[PDB]
Amino acid sequence: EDAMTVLTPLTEKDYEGLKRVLRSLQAHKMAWPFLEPVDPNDAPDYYGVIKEPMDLATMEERVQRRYYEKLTEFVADMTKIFDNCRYYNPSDSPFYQCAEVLESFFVQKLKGFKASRSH
Ligand SMILES: CC(=O)Nc1ccc(CN2CCOCC2)cc1
16 A cells, blocks of 8 residues: 555545445445344354454444544455455355455445545
């Protein structure tokens, strides 16, 4: 990551952009498994294996409360969603496929956000 991403504080204008990025992911057709925390009734062994769970509703709460100080911290939480999914599920599962698709989409939107900060 470049120096702006790591070290430039998130301004109010930056936060409006983060809200838009998040809403785009929440509206994606392949985002359904990630919208809310993993349901322990459906996955009884999940919280024993995955030590730092993450989901898009937890990220929305954090954005609203201005939890993030630097872009790198927002990117780290998002990346945790996808990394947790690829570690827990096998490579041939529909969950794994959704992570592949949605991470690619996130990278496209994140590049757009970074461009709009510098110009
Ligand atoms: C985002 C995420 O990883 N979700 C998730 C949801 C349920 C399970 C539990 N299993 C999966 C396949 O077998 C039936 C139930 C595992 C992972």
